[PDB]
Specification:
Adenovirus Type 5 Fiber Protein (Receptor Binding Domain), globular, 6-stranded antiparallel sheet, viral protein, homotrimer, mainly beta, binds N-acetyl-alpha-neuraminic acid, 5-stranded antiparallel sheet
Chain lengths: 138, 138, 138
């Protein structure tokens, strides 16, 4: 078909926009808030999906940050690796290969973001990558 | 169509289950043994596909671990990055971004797992990621 | 449908071959110059897409290497992580998880390759991964 619009919404009401295509057993979904642009002929600007502490569940264990979501779609996605910047409370930051999924618990979608140990508590995780999940249904 | 079930089997007879969708030139395949769950409202549990030494070919060169497989499907997949835990024989372990493919040699499928140098011989590689390959046929 | 052939071409006229499948809103595209082979029953050979300095725009900022392309297709792809080897001018080299995209500026396709800091100027980036992008159109 053609690409349908949609979004999820976080605890703090941040809106995660996306375009999808549901085919037979197949759901493909791209998050569209941070598509990066060449601003001019020589510079590439990454954009971020900024997720703060208050969008994650507490406690956090095993550098696993869970983002309970609302609305949107209910998928058990594969895992995709992405570019993360992780901001510590002291404003230190660390660029990492993070690993994201969509999963469902109690019929609610959640984003699973896993990354590496950091020397502090995290203030914010920025996702600098354009994310697309190809999911299988049923 | 709807998602068909399938599996590969290793030298040591470990069974690698998967769901797929074959469309025209297109084969999409997700491994389903290690789909991770929120066990309760706050904890996310990763599962592993555990591959021991005896599932790989010898000799091993360039931190490339080849897993000759049986049955299943014959695809030259793209490369997907995943979360690996690599267990050394002294039970030390290292978390890495590993890179997997499906390829075919002498009409047999093989899994290609590449990762980083470690200070020892490897006892086991665990794949903590949900793997899905989108492959092109012909 | 069945997988169509195609290519892009760089500033220095290097040819980037690929196979694709355009469905309704969906373009899937695999680069085919570096599909890796088991050369014999025990050895896996990676191949590279070798990109030299003269294929990138200048100046380079934020370890972001832009490869302006010609012909081929015009897609705003998601970001895919890949295996990079980065060769310095002193022939030192660094293996990295790099992150690639296809994007369009002034109606021209460009490849966006991002990677980590290195202690020197880069002579060449080799992409050791088989790249496939699943893109959404419109
Ligand atoms: C990945 C996965 O299987 N998720 C499932 C979870 C967990 O499996 C439970 O913890 C097992 O009881 O269970 C559900 O029934 C749920 O609560 O929404 C369906 C959901 O898709
Ligand atoms: C990635 C790839 O091309 N794999 C192919 C290999 C190698 O190319 C050979 O080493 C070249 O002789 O060859 C086959 O004929 C084979 O033995 O199964 C088909 C297989 O798909
Ligand atoms: C990712 C993205 O949006 N790229 C678009 C760019 C930039 O957005 C411009 O810098 C905004 O003016 O604009 C176009 O009009 C262009 O020049 O080709 C279309 C292109 O797809």
């Amino acid at each position: 078909g053609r690409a349908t619009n949609g979004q999820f919404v976080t605890k703090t009401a941040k809106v995660l926009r996306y375009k999808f295509v549901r085919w037979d057993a197949l759901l493909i979904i791209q998050f569209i808030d941070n598509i990066g642009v060449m601003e001019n002929p020589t510079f590439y600007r990454n954009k971020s999906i900024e997720l703060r502490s208050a969008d994650f569940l507490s406690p956090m264990l095993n550098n696993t940050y869970i983002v309970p979501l609302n609305g949107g779609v209910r998928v058990e996605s594969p895992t995709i690796p992405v570019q993360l910047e992780v901001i510590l409370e002291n404003n230190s930051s660390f660029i990492q290969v993070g690993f994201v999924r969509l999963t469902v618990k109690n019929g609610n979608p959640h984003m699973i973001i896993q990354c590496n140990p950091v020397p502090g508590n995290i203030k914010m995780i920025k996702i600098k990558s354009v994310m697309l999940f190809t999911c299988l249904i049923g």
